[PDB]
From a paper:
Photosystem II (PSII) produces dioxygen by extracting electrons and protons from water, which takes place at the oxygen-evolving complex (OEC), an oxo-bridged Mn4CaO5 cluster with a shape that resembles a distorted chair. In conjunction with the oxidation of the OEC, protons are released in a 1:0:1:2 stoichiometry for the S0–S1, S1–S2, S2–S3 and S3–(S4)–S0 transitions, and two water molecules are split to produce a dioxygen in the S3–(S4)–S0 transition, after which the OEC returns to its most reduced S0 state. Here we use pump-probe serial femtosecond crystallography to reveal the structural dynamics of PSII from nanoseconds to milliseconds after illumination with one flash (1F) or two flashes (2F). We identify structural changes associated with electron transfer, proton release and water delivery at various regions, including QA–QB, YZ, the OEC and the O1, O4 and Cl-1 channels.
From Δt2 = 20 ns to Δt2 = 30 µs, the QA head rotated in a counterclockwise direction, and this was accompanied by a movement of the non-haem iron towards QA—structural changes similar to those observed after 1F. However, the difference densities associated with these structural changes were much weaker after 2F. After 2F, difference densities start to appear only after Δt2 = 200 ns. No difference density appears on the OEC at Δt2 ≤ 200 ns, suggesting that no structural changes to the OEC occur in this time range. At Δt2 = 20 ns to Δt2 = 200 ns, there is no difference density in the O1 channel. No noticeable difference densities are observed in the O4 channel at Δt2 = 20 ns–1 μs.
Residue numbers in the entry:
A (entry chain E): 4 to 84
B (entry chain F): 12 to 45
C (entry chain D): 11 to 352
D (entry chain C): 23 to 473
E (entry chain V): 1 to 137
F (entry chain A): 11 to 344
Write the structure that this text describes.
């Protein structure tokens, strides 16, 4: 043994479960709200189902320049009306 | 008898804490409609 | 001299539940970041602006179709640092430009270095020979040749494999249609090493389990073994007679047997890596010139080699426009190769 | 806790059911409880299928495997396989579901309440695996039960409404079977047919008179053999050829079930008589022949002479000859010319497909049947996207024949592995070296060296 | 991009009258199309006769014209050949032949409109993918 | 000591350099027949009309093949699943044109290899061994049945069985992808884990045992001379190996029981290959890999492509080109 407390000891102790009956659901709900508030879309820049294309276009907003790539994406995002 | 905050404790939680948050994020996605 | 270096050394090498070591300073952050980046990217990040593809759980992909996809072809072989001239510190733009791909690939590469240093480090403390580290050079040779050397020979990172299940399947099929990679003898040797390794694994495991000495009374034979016993738990002599009579030849040197089990899959992976180094330059085993000369002149000459090239040609023409959107291929229906009816 | 740990029994928990080998009373409970599970699934699954069943859709569009079995027996269907009354399906499900509680009850009682061994309690129900006379007597009881079961199919066919006959003149219908085939040259002639293309061994049975008459012979044979094995004990040649132990008897059964699983796989894949395509969808050969038929019909209506249309290879575009001369459909379906089905046979003459019947006698119901089967070919993805592997999403379909064939090949394969596992173990345990080699008595050390 | 009322506006008849479907109608049309039609018409092609597809341009040149709700609803009652010369109810599913095509027995007039609407709207979404076949998959 | 008993004692003798046995009595002639026909056909057989369309494919060395392109070509699609022994042909020339040899080779081979599996059981009984080495061999054996017999059965023709050649194997794999999307099938995926995992654990076990060899030699000699065939004592220190690998991962991820270690080595590739064999055998009945073509749709209804859709494009290329002259109607239903 390496001295840490056995896992089977810890996860059958009431104190473990008093703590983690709160911390586990709290993290789950935090993750749910990251999505349900729509925050995940804006952090990572991921299209919503209604923002892949403009209403009549069918071309991909594909990046084609290396050093103006950032401006190209910003331009594609404006053209969504 | 035993400590509470060890290296093992940190290793466990750097993995377990984001896992639960991600599981909740992915569960919410199952209700997104187009 | 018991300075801070030696005190630090003491703490790093404590016998804990997770050994750390000096190698752990490199291994743990890079491994964790490479895994966390793959999970973050496959859960939340799109491939719309680099590939025209949805690629995350957020967008409705499943475990088989999510990926962290390669950057756009226009990025070349850019390191794509978050603070570099493309993303310019913008975390959201960085994600849209494919910065997670180089992030995962580069932290992964240094993470692999760290795991192999860990194998050396632990082996030196325990006092065993470092053959486990030596065997791990083959996964490193594969990772480096496929994820780094190969795109570096090509036009850009875009043509490297993307980190996802179905994305890797597309990589396999791209290699058939464009490189005729099944024809390549360096791939053939790798196939031999992988399948011969799985064979050796199966047959050595089964031979040991069916030449066990009766060292206990229970019908479960697992208990009748003690890690510190001095005797072999199975009969090498009965194993040797069985295979000599079933197969003609058999192992007789148990040390040779286990070195061979190291040798076969490791040599395989190394051979496959060399062939991919060639594909970095399109230096393919694509054709047999003698077959092409005969087939060009003799329209009744047909082999399974000529049949497969026709499949490759179908793969290239039908997948290229969608798989290489930056090229802007417009192939009218009338130019597409097709058999009758289909 | 008699034999309920590894120390007493010698078997670890993951081989825990091996602890039951010499506890006939608990072993009885395990077997009865398990039969209850089988009867439960049959009843519950039927009710699930019925609840999910829309009578206006073909059964094969709805993921049904049990209702097709009931409909084939003549319950709930009329001409053309149309569903006329879903009540028999309800009955069959409810009665299996109710019976599973009786079996569950007995199984749980014997397993945990009743006597652990039966030999002290009753010498009739008690048994010793090594008692060759008692084992063949139990075997004989079960052969008599099996024989009665086969006669129940005969009784349904001849006295209680009949069977669904896909070949019946007029599009398929329930028909009473009045003259079952009894000529043993016909019945046993099926057993000596080659299993290869155009012959098909017993999978080729193609009429109900043969099916019914074959069950008369099997019924009598089982009853007789059951009487024989009650009255006899194994002969000397048999005594010396077998291993006589519980695990050995298990292994023989596993081999038998594997064999049957593989046969069932082919039956459901090729046979369209006892697996009617009205209920199960067309076979693979059937849908492929149906495509050729559909395009022959379309092109002929446009004015093509399909008899003389030369295809790109030099073979006929629509029609060609089989290797023995029969006129057959062309294209890649040339491999399926052994297909026989009620919608196609009116076009058949002595030489195969008859060009005069093709030109003049193709009825709209045949065009309908062929277009339906061509678009319900047993191709489809694991997530039930119907069609070739390159098809887009839209059609939620996988043929019942694909579900039934794949599941039973997988089951049959693992049951062959289980036969090898337990037959090899039974041999080793009987001879006494199933736990390893005795160090002081290692046989190979007493043998001359090979070189 | 979004499923807007403009997308959902389609010709009602040959005289130029339009009708605007609801999202619920369009989605009901898609479900009913999969139920009754997609086994031969998946993607707007025709598996048992690929010469005829469900592209609006093809439907416009049918006789009588089928590129509007009334024409398509009439086709599902009494289908004809492309030139109108023959009645094909005996080999094509329709209300007239619901006895031999049982899936048509539980379609109502309101269902036919929804299916018709699906067929007219999908090309406006999918472009060439509708009726294009494998080349555009 | 009558003559039958004498023959039986020779057949089952544990003293023959190669064990014969009762399975060997079927094995030896069927494997000889298949081997001799294979070698002759591989060198000298004339071209074969595999797809039944009078378009013969050349497989042998004398007709323009090298080792990589050569094959014994599967029998004609016109034959389908019909039995075609030499005596069903009007001449040897007919038999050869129609791919007769393929049927003779694979039927003798499948018989012989099945008996090779029983022979493994049989000798283990004569030597007092445990009986399950043959269970491990059932996984490669089942794979051979899948591609030479089961897949032809479900598809209706031996012409879609795997060719007996290197490039022929590749052709089989490519068309299999087009028609079943085998990459997207979980059983092929388990097969890959079976053989990738099998190769990993092979190098793993070999490197750990080699790392903990007990010093018995000088540096000028091979360490392999430190083990002597038949010796009573183990040649490496499994406790040192466990102590290394336990610290590499964590202590409880490491085996210290050699018997369950070696059981794990046996089970992982064998179970994985069983699933691979069951993938081929179930796709034989057209229950194909996952289809996510056009699964992701935007708000308006535009198709949003995934990597699955790029795979589909590649599959379509393989589909439209394979057997370019053999289809007259639009659906490749078998
Ligand atoms: C073994 C264990 C190892 C353990 C893992 C180690 C992990 C370390 C990670 C290091 C990552 C290295 C990143 C290299 C990026 C790169 O290369 O980036 C590539 C750049 C060159 O950039 C490329 O240059 C190309 C050529 O352009 C040139 O030509 C153009 C067209 O004519 C124009 O004229 C243009 O102006 C001119 O620059 C194109 O422009 C490409 O788009 C552009 O990406 O080189 C450079 O950064 C530097 C080039 C010199 C150093 C190369 C040595 C290292 C790589 C060796 C691999 C050999 C590969 C050959 C194929 C086999
Ligand atoms: C004790 C062991 C002893 C061993 C004995 C060895 C002797 C030979 C073994 C048999 C070899 C079989 C090879 C051919 C199998 C086959 O082509 O099977 C097909 C036949 C069915 O034949 C088909 O039968 C059809 C009959 O349908 C006809 O009749 C129907 C009537 O409804 C329809 O009308 C239909 O349209 C019409 O065509 C046609 O004739 C077809 O042409 C014909 O191909 O199946 C059948 O006979 C029955 C199924 C046989 C079992 C299938 C083999 C599976 C083996 C798996 C082993 C795995 C091992 C793993 C190792 C680890
Ligand atoms: C069909 C599946 C099946 C069946 C019928 C059995 C049956 C049996 N097992 Mg086996 N076993 C199985 C699967 C099965 N097993 C599996 C999957 C494993 C691996 C985990 C094992 C591992 C195993 C071990 C290690 C052992 C057994 C033993 C036994 C026997 C005694 C069990 C006991 O005393 O429990 C007592 C348990 C209870 C009293 C708790 C509840 C039990 C009841 C029956 C639950 C049923 C509830 C049901 C819904 C009620 C319906 C009632 C209604 C009809 C009125 C019994 C005959 C034992 C044995 O061999 O004894 C000699 C034994 O040691 N089994
Ligand atoms: C009617 C058929 C039958 C019967 C009565 C037996 C009976 C027995 N077997 Mg045998 N066996 C069989 C078929 C059968 N087997 C088949 C078909 C195979 C091939 C796979 C085997 C392979 C086999 C092996 C390798 C061994 C046995 C052993 C045994 C003995 C102990 C079994 C036990 O307690 O398992 C306990 C049950 C479990 C531990 C549970 C297994 C869980 C399975 C794998 C899950 C399967 C997945 C499921 C189908 C779907 C997924 C579910 C999930 C999504 C929830 C017992 C005498 C042991 C023995 O030799 O004793 C003498 C032994 O070592 N069997
Ligand atoms: C003979 C077996 C069999 C067959 C051929 C079918 C066939 C079918 N079922 Mg039924 N069913 C069965 C048994 C079977 N079922 C059982 C045992 C249950 C209770 C769990 C059900 C309960 C059920 C429900 C509730 C439903 C169906 C439905 C269906 C239809 C769709 C199937 C599907 O999409 O699966 C999806 C595919 C899978 C889930 C793949 C499973 C992979 C398994 C886990 C692999 C196991 C391998 C092996 C056994 C383990 C070996 C381990 C090794 C170590 C030895 C199809 C007609 C559906 C339907 O359409 O009803 C009308 C439906 O809703 N079935
Ligand atoms: C094959 C299954 C089977 C077998 C071999 C046995 C055998 C036995 N049972 Mg068990 N049992 C079973 C199933 C079985 N049972 C079922 C399904 C139940 C729930 C009903 C029970 C509930 C049960 C209880 C509560 C008791 C037993 C007892 C016994 C012992 C004495 C029985 C006797 O002498 O009856 C004499 C014979 C008869 C009374 C004739 C019965 C005829 C049946 C009821 C009519 C149907 C016959 C026909 C073949 C059924 C076809 C069913 C098929 C469609 C599934 C004997 C060892 C006794 C025991 O263990 O003593 C300690 C005891 O107390 N059994
Ligand atoms: C579940 C059903 C069943 C089982 C398990 C048994 C089991 C037994 N029977 Mg019984 N028997 C049965 C049903 C059964 N029988 C029926 C229904 C009848 C009436 C026909 C008989 C009539 C009968 C007689 C007259 C005798 C037995 C005997 C025996 C014993 C010897 C078995 C043997 O050596 O077979 C091995 C099989 C053979 C030796 C057959 C020849 C070998 C050929 C070449 C194998 C061919 C395999 C091939 C793949 C076939 C595929 C299908 C084929 C039709 C084309 C054994 C205990 C013997 C005994 O000891 O009686 C006391 C005996 O003399 N049985
Ligand atoms: C296969 C059994 C089919 C089913 C199910 C459905 N359709 Fe069909 N359709 C089919 C064929 C063979 C044809 C051509 C018929 C001919 O000979 O002209 C058609 C044609 C149509 C058309 C006309 C297309 C055009 O003129 O371009 C329409 C509008 C049509 N079909 C609609 C339709 C609907 C709405 C269906 C579900 C109720 C349906 N079809 C099913 C074959 C099959
Ligand atoms: C990138 C990046 C970063 C990082 C991040 C991180 C680090 C993250 C992490 C993350 C994580 C860490 C996550 C996780 C997740 C997890 C998950 C999501 C899981 C899931 C699972 C499941 C689902 C399971 C399943 C299963 C299996 C697998 C088998 C068994 C059975 C079962 C079924 C259970 C930073 C910030 C630095 C910077 C920027 C960039
Ligand atoms: C021994 C043992 C075991 C086993 C057990 C078993 C196997 C049991 C079975 C059991 C069973 C097998 C049971 C059954 C039951 C049943 C029931 C209980 C039923 C009921 C029914 C009902 C109530 C019905 C109803 C209805 C109607 C009538 C109408 C329609 C609708 C409905 C459905 C509602 C185990 C493994 C656990 C382990 C331990 C030992
Ligand atoms: C119902 C029906 C029918 C009929 C049927 C019949 C009549 C059947 C019979 C069957 C039979 C009649 C079968 C048999 C079988 C047998 C077997 C399967 C056997 C086996 C054997 C064995 C296994 C052996 C083994 C061995 C050897 C070889 C050596 C020595 C040792 C031993 C013993 C191990 C028909 C088709 C008409 C139609 C449909 C329905
Ligand atoms: C980079 C690390 C180089 C070690 S540096 C070294 O560290 C010692 C601590 O033991 C000090 O006592 C000493 O002054 C210092 O030179
Ligand atoms: Cl065709």
């Amino acid at each position: 043994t390496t001295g840490e407390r056995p896992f089977s000891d810890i996860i059958t102790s009431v104190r473990y479960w008093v703590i983690h009956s709160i911390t586990i659901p709290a993290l789950f709900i935090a993750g749910w709200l990251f999505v349900s508030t729509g925050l995940a879309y804006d952090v990572f820049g991921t299209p919503r189902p209604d923002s892949y294309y403009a209403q009549e276009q069918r071309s991909i907003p594909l990046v084609t320049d290396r050093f103006e790539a950032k401006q190209q994406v910003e331009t594609f995002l404006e053209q969504l009306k | 008898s035993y400590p509470i905050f060890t290296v093992r404790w940190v290793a466990v939680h750097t993995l377990a804490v984001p896992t639960i948050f991600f599981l909740g994020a992915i569960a919410a996605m199952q209700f997104i409609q187009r | 001299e018991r300075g801070w270096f030696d005190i630090l050394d003491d703490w790093l090498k404590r016998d804990r539940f997770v050994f750390v070591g000096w190698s752990g300073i490199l291994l743990f952050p890079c491994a964790y970041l490479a895994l966390g980046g793959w999970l973050t990217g496959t859960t939340f990040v799109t491939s719309w602006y680099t590939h025209g593809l949805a690629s995350s759980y957020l967008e409705g992909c499943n475990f088989l179709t999510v990926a962290v996809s390669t950057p756009a072809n226009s990025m070349g072989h850019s390191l794509l640092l978050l603070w570099g001239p493309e993303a310019q510190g913008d975390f959201t733009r960085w994600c849209q430009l494919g910065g997670l791909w180089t992030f995962i690939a580069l932290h992964g590469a240094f993470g692999l270095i760290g795991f192999m240093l860990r194998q050396f480090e632990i082996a030196r403390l325990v006092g065993v020979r470092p053959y486990n580290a030596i065997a791990f050079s083959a996964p490193i040779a594969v990772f480096v040749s496929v994820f780094l050397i190969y795109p570096l020979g090509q036009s850009s990172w875009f043509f490297a494999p993307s980190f996802g299940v179905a994305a890797i399947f597309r990589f396999l099929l791209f290699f058939q249609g464009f490189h005729n990679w099944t024809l390549n003898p360096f791939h053939m040797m790798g196939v031999a090493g992988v399948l011969g390794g799985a064979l050796l694994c199966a047959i050595h495991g089964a031979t040991v389990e069916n030449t066990l000495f009766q060292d206990g009374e229970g019908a479960s034979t697992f208990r009748a073994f003690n890690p510190t016993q001095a005797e072999e738990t199975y009969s090498m002599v009965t194993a040797n007679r069985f295979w000599s009579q079933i197969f003609g030849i058999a192992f007789s040197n148990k040390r040779w047997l286990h070195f061979f089990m190291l040798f076969v899959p490791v040599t395989g992976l190394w051979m496959s890596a060399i062939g991919v180094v060639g594909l970095a330059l399109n230096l393919r085993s694509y054709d047999f010139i003698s077959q092409e000369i005969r087939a060009a002149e003799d329209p009744e000459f047909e082999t399974f080699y000529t049949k497969n090239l026709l499949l490759n040609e179908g793969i290239r023409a039908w997948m290229a426009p969608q798989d290489q959107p930056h090229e802007n291929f417009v192939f009218p229906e009338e130019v597409l190769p097709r058999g009758n009816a289909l | 806790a008699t034999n309920r740990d590894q120390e007493s029994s010698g078997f670890a928990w993951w081989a825990g059911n091996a602890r039951l080998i010499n506890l006939s009373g608990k072993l009885l409970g395990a077997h009865v409880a398990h039969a209850g599970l089988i009867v439960f699934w049959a009843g519950a699954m039927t009710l699930f299928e019925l609840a999910h069943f829309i009578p206006e859709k073909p059964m094969y569009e709805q993921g049904l495997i049990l209702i097709p079995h009931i409909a084939t027996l003549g319950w709930g269907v009329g001409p053309g396989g149309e569903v006329v009354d879903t009540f028999p399906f309800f009955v069959v499900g409810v009665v299996h579901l109710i019976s599973s509680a009786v079996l569950g009850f007995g199984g749980v009682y014997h397993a945990i309440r009743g006597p652990e061994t039966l030999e002290e309690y009753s010498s009739f129900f008690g048994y010793d695996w090594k008692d060759k006379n008692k084992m063949t007597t139990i075997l004989g009881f079960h052969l008599i039960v099996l024989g009665i079961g086969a006669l129940l199919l005969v009784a349904k066919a001849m006295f209680f409404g009949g069977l669904y006959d896909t070949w019946a003149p007029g599009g398929g219908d329930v028909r009473v079977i009045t003259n079952p085939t009894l000529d043993p040259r016909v019945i046993f002639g099926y057993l000596l047919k080659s299993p290869f293309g155009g012959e098909g061994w017993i999978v080729s049975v193609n009429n109900l008179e043969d099916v019914v008459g074959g069950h008369i012979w099997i019924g009598l044979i089982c009853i007789a053999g059951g009487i024989w094995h009650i009255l006899t004990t194994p002969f000397g040649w048999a005594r010396r050829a077998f291993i006589w132990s519980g695990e050995a008897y298990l292994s023989y059964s596993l081999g038998a079930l594997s064999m049957m699983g593989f046969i069932a796989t082919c039956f459901v894949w090729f046979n369209n008589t006892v697996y009617p395509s009205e209920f199960y969808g067309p076979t693979g050969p059937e849908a492929s022949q149906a495509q050729a038929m559909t395009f022959l019909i379309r092109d002929q209506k446009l004015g093509a002479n399909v008899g003389s249309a030369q295809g790109p290879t030099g073979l006929g575009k629509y029609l060609m000859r089989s290797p023995t001369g029969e006129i057959i459909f062309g294209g890649e379906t040339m491999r399926f010319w052994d297909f026989r089905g009620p919608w196609l046979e009116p076009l058949r003459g002595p030489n195969g497909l008859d060009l005069n019947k093709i030109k003049n006698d193709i009825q709209p119901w045949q065009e309908r049947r062929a277009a339906e089967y061509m678009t319900h070919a047993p191709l489809g993805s694991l997530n039930s996207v119907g069609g070739v592997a390159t098809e887009i999403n839209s059609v939620n379909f996988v043929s019942p024949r694909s579900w039934l064939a794949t599941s039973h090949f997988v089951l049959a394969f693992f049951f062959l592995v289980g036969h090898l596992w337990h037959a090899g173990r039974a041999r080793a345990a009987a001879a006494g070296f199933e736990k390893g080699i005795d160090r002081e008595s290692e046989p190979v050390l007493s043998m001359p060296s090979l070189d | 991009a979004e499923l807007t009322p403009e997308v959902l506006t389609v010709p009602l008849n040959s005289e130029g009258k339009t009708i605007t479907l609801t999202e619920k109608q369009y989605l009901e049309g898609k479900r009913l199309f999969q139920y009754a039609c997609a086994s031969c018409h998946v993607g707007g092609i025709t598996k048992t006769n690929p010469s005829l597809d469900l592209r609006t341009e093809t439907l416009a040149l049918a006789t009588p014209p089928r590129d509007n709700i009334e024409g398509l609803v009439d086709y599902m009652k009494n289908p004809t050949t492309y030139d109108g010369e023959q009645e094909i109810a005996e080999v094509h599913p329709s209300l007239r032949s619901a006895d031999i095509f049982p899936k048509m027995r539980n379609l109502t007039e309101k269902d036919l409109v929804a299916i018709a609407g699906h067929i007219l709207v999908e090309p406006k979404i999918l472009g060439d993918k509708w009726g294009g076949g494998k080349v555009y998959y | 000591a009558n003559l039958w008993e004498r023959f039986c004692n020779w057949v089952t003798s544990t003293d023959n350099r190669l064990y014969v046995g009762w399975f060997g009595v079927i094995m030896i002639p069927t494997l000889l027949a298949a081997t001799i026909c294979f070698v002759i056909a591989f060198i000298a057989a004339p071209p074969v009309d595999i797809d039944g369309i009078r378009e013969p494919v050349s497989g042998s060395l004398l007709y323009g093949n090298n080792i990589i392109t050569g094959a014994v070509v599967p029998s004609s699609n016109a034959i389908g699943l019909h039995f075609y022994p030499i005596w069903e042909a009007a001449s040897l020339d007919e038999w050869l044109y129609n791919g007769g040899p393929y049927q003779l080779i694979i039927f003798h081979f499948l018989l012989g290899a099945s008996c090779y599996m029983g022979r493994q059981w049989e000798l283990s009984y004569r030597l007092g061994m445990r009986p399950w080495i043959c269970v491990a061999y059932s996984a490669p054996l089942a794979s051979a049945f899948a591609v030479f017999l089961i897949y032809p059965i479900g598809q209706g023709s031996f012409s879609d069985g795997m060719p007996l050649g290197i490039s022929g194997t590749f052709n089989f794999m490519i068309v299999f992808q087009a028609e079943h999307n085998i990459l997207m099938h979980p059983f092929h995926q388990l097969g890959v884990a079976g053989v990738f995992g099998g190769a990993l654990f092979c190098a793993m076990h070999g490197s750990l045992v080699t790392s903990s060899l007990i010093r018995e030699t000088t540096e000028t000699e091979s360490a392999n001379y430190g083990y002597k065939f038949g010796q009573e004592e183990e040649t490496y220190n499994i406790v040192a190996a466990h102590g290394y690998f336990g610290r590499l991962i964590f202590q409880y991820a490491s085996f210290n029981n050699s018997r369950s270690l070696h059981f794990f080595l046996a089970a992982w590739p064998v179970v994985g290959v069983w699933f691979a064999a069951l993938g081929i055998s179930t796709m034989a009945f057209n229950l194909n890999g996952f289809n996510f073509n056009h699964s992701v749709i935007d708000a308006k209804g535009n198709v949003i492509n995934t990597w699955a859709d790029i795979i589909n494009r590649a599959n379509l290329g393989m589909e439209v080109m394979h057997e370019r002259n053999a289809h007259n109607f639009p659906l490749d239903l078998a």
